[PDB]
């Protein structure tokens, strides 16, 4: 039960919408793990001055190796010094193609399963929309160029068009009825049943959440969810650099440079596993093309304008399309929003003029404009959408460097003891 | 609404422009100032290149109630100063309304480049509104 010093530096960088691992540490059952990270985060040089600050999120999860290797792990630990070695997973034969899990692809082109599987588990349990397809690549080598190097894509910050009710939301519930009569008792049950269905669709799609519904609870082992140990978030601001020569005089370049601390309070590691810490930089989806929902409606009806409570609480969801929110909105992208939601929140505004000035991190094209009539593709952040505003991604879009001070108490014979025989 | 006070290297004190200075103009005799009718004069009487077709009706001895800003005629042609380097209404014709209303082009001259028009701004609008509004949960839930 002595101290092991695992502190270390980390220089990293990535694409906008994608979730990248910035530091992982293997731990052992019985370990007491504490982590205090501190550093600075920056963005590649901007074409113009500063406009809006990006929002940065840092996470640190704990994942039991058992969650990865399954029964195979249990045997491993059980059989002890007789265990059949754990298998490695494969990566594409390229240095960077392991980037998502924070490591260079080693000489043999394969990395420990716990890195890959954890990243997956983390993504599937907290980052993707609950209704989106569960991410299930088997090997880092099954990942595509972008994903493998920069991490998976995550959802845009929540707004009316990026947080629609799950696409399969019921818009009407049918109930059969005998040719001339209706069982009012059945109708009653019908509603009840519906209620359970809705609650589920709207917010209890995950087992754990259903059980919470009953006022019960579930261990993280129940559904194999990575354990979130610490979540930090902050805005990334900086300064402008003044141009001073004959032609650059009166010009500006935004240099974003933000300092930040991410500290995990002493945590007890019950079983062997990994402590992964990842980052995610995003820009609120402002767009000179989005307009208030009501500004777009052609026939304004009492139900739209009035804001009559009696109606707002008993109507079904409303199906509308991106065309109804952005001028160049794609009509093929349908979303189901809650009635009179446009009266519950206001959207950001950008004069159409900024629409074509390179250097602003605004979405100068309605979301999903180049991914086709596909909702998921519009919701997930497309990092290219930002290529336009950077002088040059020599270090991708963002980048950072920080010191990770890690102290871990654990049973560990001194190096002297290891190297000495008698 | 962003505006620039209409300073102009071409405007001069009314009295500097009068050709025949009369007792009524100079004296500033109260007895007169309170009982005479308005005075009709033209932009020509206020700016060197003033348009004579633009007539205005001012109050007697008003020039004695306020002083005008001054800009040495030298700045008159230096690009970069938001001064009206041309008597107001100089390019809109003998039309008063057109002279009074601010002509934004009058300023094009002093900007390196209107990539973002002439002005621009960004701000956070914190709005809080109390109102009768069922929760989103209530809207999306049937029963």
């Amino acid at each position: 039960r002595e101290i092991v010093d695992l502190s270390h530096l980390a220089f990293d960088c990535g694409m906008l919408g994608r979730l990248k691992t910035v530091s992982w540490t293997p731990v052992i059952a019985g370990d007491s793990f504490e982590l205090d990270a501190v550093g600075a985060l920056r963005l590649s040089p901007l074409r113009r001055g500063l406009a809006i600050d990006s929002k940065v999120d840092f996470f640190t999860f704990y994942i039991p190796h058992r969650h990865v290797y399954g029964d195979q792990w249990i045997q491993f630990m059980r059989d002890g010094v007789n265990a059949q070695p754990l298998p490695s997973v494969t990566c594409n034969r390229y240095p960077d193609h392991a980037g998502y899990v924070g490591t260079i692809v080693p000489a043999n082109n394969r990395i420990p399963k716990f890195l890959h599987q954890s990243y997956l588990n983390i993504y599937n349990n907290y980052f993707r929309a609950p209704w989106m397809p569960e991410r299930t690549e088997a090997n880092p080598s099954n990942l595509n160029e972008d994903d493998a190097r920069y991490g998976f894509r995550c959802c845009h910050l929540k707004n009316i068009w990026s947080a629609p009710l799950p696409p399969e939301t019921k818009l009407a519930e049918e109930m059969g009825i005998e040719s001339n009569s209706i069982d009012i008792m059945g109708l009653q049950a019908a509603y009840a049943q519906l209620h359970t269905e809705q609650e589920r669709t709207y917010f209890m799609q995950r087992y754990r959440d259903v059980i919470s519904s009953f006022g019960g609870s579930t261990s993280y082992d129940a559904d194999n969810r990575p354990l979130l140990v610490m979540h930090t978030d902050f805005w990334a601001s900086g300064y402008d650099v003044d141009g001073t020569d004959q032609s650059s005089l009166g010009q500006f370049s935004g240099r974003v440079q933000q300092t930040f601390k991410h500290s995990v309070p002493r945590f007890f590691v019950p079983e062997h596993g990994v402590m992964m810490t990842l980052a995610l930089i995003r820009f609120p989806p402002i767009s000179p093309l989005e307009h208030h929902y009501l500004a777009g409606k052609s026939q304004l009806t009492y139900t739209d304008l009035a804001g009559d409570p009696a109606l707002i609480g008993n109507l079904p969801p409303r199906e509308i399309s991106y065309r109804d929110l952005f001028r160049d909105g794609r009509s093929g992208i349908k979303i189901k929003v809650a009635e009179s939601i446009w009266y519950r929140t206001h959207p950001d505004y950008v004069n159409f003029k900024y629409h074509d000035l390179h250097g602003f991190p605004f979405l100068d094209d309605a979301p999903g404009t180049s991914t086709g009539d596909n909702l998921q593709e519009a919701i997930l952040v497309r990092h290219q959408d930002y290529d336009a505003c950077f002088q040059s991604q020599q270090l991708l879009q963002w980048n950072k460097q920080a010191r990770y001070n890690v102290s871990v108490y654990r049973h560990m014979p001194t190096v002297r003891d290891s190297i000495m025989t008698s | 609404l962003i505006r620039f006070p209409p300073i102009s290297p071409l405007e001069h004190h009314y009295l500097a422009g009068k050709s025949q200075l009369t007792y009524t103009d100079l004296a500033g005799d109260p007895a007169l100032i309170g009982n005479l009718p308005p005075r009709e004069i033209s932009y020509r009487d206020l700016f060197r290149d003033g348009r004579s077709g633009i007539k205005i009706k001012v109050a007697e001895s008003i020039w004695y109630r306020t002083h005008p800003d001054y800009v040495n005629f030298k700045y008159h042609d230096l690009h970069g100063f938001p001064f009206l380097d041309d008597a107001p209404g100089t390019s809109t014709g003998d039309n008063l309304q057109e002279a009074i209303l601010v002509r934004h082009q009058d300023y094009d001259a002093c900007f390196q480049s209107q990539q973002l028009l002439q002005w621009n701004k960004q701000a956070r609008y914190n709005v809080s509104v109390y109102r009768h509004m069922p929760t989103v949960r209530d809207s999306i839930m049937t029963s």
Binding site: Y202, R344 | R137
Partner: peptide, 24 residues
Amino acid sequence: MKKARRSPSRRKGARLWYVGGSQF
């Protein structure tokens, strides 16, 4: 000009986004 760079949080008020569960 501190807040003006960062899009508000809309933290005041009730819950607006139901998307099936927790989404970061």
